[PDB]
Amino acid sequence: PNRSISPSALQDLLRTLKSPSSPQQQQQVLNILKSNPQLMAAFIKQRTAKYVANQPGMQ
Structure with missing residues (x-):
């Protein structure tokens, strides 16, 4: 299985x-x-509501 996750849980x-x-x-x-x-x-x-989407490739 490449996706052995429980759908019931999802x-x-x-x-x-x-x-x-x-x-x-x-x-x-x-x-x-x-x-x-x-x-x-x-x-x-995603840290809920914290903005940690800061990568040193943005101009």
């Missing part, structure tokens, strides 16, 4: 991400992100 993550009007949003999403680490890695790499 689909459940979608549910959780879309409903933020609850204390569960922060807790559950992060835990689900841990279940599908590749997506967690992407989110962490």
Whole structure:
């Protein structure tokens, strides 16, 4: 398998991400992100709302 990730986790993550009007949003999403680490890695790499997209190749 080149993509041995759990779709059940991803689909459940979608549910959780879309409903933020609850204390569960922060807790559950992060835990689900841990279940599908590749997506967690992407989110962490973006640093949420911090702008770390600064590479010394921009003019």
